[PDB]
């Protein structure tokens, strides 16, 4: 009913996930089935492009990764993690992977196109979100992490840049680049500097509790308009993170400050989401008292913000980027390394 309804859902969810995890989907499209239109965002080893699928007429977002750049930066395993996990997951606030494939030069992950843009762009423009506004988004991330963590997954790159706003004003989490299935502890120094938990920085082993720290950082940034730990350079950021001292804006409610003290907690035996009651300590907190968790999951709550959408193919909610020719060699690059992709 209350706890039994969630348990039964998660048990069936793991069943579905494990089937796709053990036998991943492969080679479900090819490059010439799409017309490439515009870059939506650039990254270290490639870009995400708005594309139009010829036979259906549907728009998609095609993440293109240069294999040679992936190998050079030692990101083979992470890239294989990214695709294997994303093709296997199913949740209302996770972006859907529609197709995946590779050619001689690149790897391709074709997602549903989330036209509303990054939360990042809206957050910086508006300045900050009101507490109810921030709470609405936070609630979706809480449920998403409850889902992912139950599958033994850690997400590892929570930030407004990786959160997209859909046509209904809801969150679509993208970028599974550092997503990893792990039952023990892990050690990779990865993520985004402002969002890193102290245990990551201090080269301690870490677990799913780093995602709950990242939630603290996200909630703070959404409600304040700036991160709790910022500087000009990553090294200076890490120093502030490790010290742990957090200051709050004068407009932060007492409830919000209490939640954040429990999220941005150095002590693993004291950090919310990592205690006996797990995710329930966050869910039952006074700051989330007005949150109807089922209604959020069912997407029945009125969104505080609906992005402007000027039809199919509209990129108005995204920044412009420099376009570049997508080169495909006549020789296969890194064939063995990406066999399973």
């Amino acid at each position: 009913s209350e706890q039994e309804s969630v348990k039964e859902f998660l048990a069936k969810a793991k069943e579905d996930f494990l089937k796709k995890w053990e036998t991943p989907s492969q080679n479900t499209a090819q490059l010439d089935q799409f017309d490439r239109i515009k870059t939506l965002g650039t990254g270290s080893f490639g870009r995400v492009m708005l594309v139009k699928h010829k036979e259906s007429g549907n728009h998609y977002a095609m993440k293109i990764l240069d294999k040679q750049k992936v190998v050079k930066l030692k990101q083979i395993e992470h890239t294989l993690n990214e695709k294997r996990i994303l093709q296997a997951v199913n949740f209302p606030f996770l972006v859907k992977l529609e197709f995946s494939f590779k050619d001689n030069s690149n790897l391709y992950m074709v997602m549903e196109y989330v036209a509303g843009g990054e939360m990042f762009s809206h957050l910086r423009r508006i300045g900050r979100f009101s507490e109810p506004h921030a709470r609405f988004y936070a609630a979706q991330i809480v449920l998403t992490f409850e889902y992912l963590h139950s599958l033994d997954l850690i997400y590892r790159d929570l930030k407004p840049e990786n959160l997209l706003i859909d046509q209904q004003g809801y969150i679509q989490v993208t970028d599974f680049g550092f997503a990893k299935r792990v039952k023990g502890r892990t050690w990779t120094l990865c993520g985004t500097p402002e969002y890193l938990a102290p245990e990551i920085i201090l080269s301690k082993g870490y677990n799913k509790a780093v995602d709950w720290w990242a939630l603290g950082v996200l909630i703070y940034e959404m409600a304040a308009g700036y991160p709790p730990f910022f500087a000009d350079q990553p090294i200076q950021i890490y120093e502030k993170i490790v010290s742990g001292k957090v200051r709050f804006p004068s407009h932060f409610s007492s409830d919000l400050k209490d939640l954040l003290r429990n999220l941005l907690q150095v002590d693993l035996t004291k950090r919310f989401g990592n205690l006996k009651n797990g995710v329930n300590d966050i869910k039952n907190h006074k700051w989330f008292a007005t949150t109807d968790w089922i209604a959020i999951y069912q997407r029945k709550v009125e969104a505080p913000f609906i992005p402007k959408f000027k039809g199919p193919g509209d990129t108005s909610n995204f920044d412009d980027y420099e376009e570049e020719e997508i080169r495909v060699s006549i020789n296969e690059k890194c064939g063995k390394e990406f066999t399973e992709f």
Binding site: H78, E161, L189, A231
Partner: peptide, 20 residues
């Protein structure tokens, strides 16, 4: 203010992920 200090910093644009 903290806001002014943030806005004057070099990290107000899209932040790239780090590794490894």
């Amino acid at each position: 203010t903290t806001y002014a200090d943030f806005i004057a910093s070099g990290r107000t644009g899209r932040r790239a992920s780090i590794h490894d």
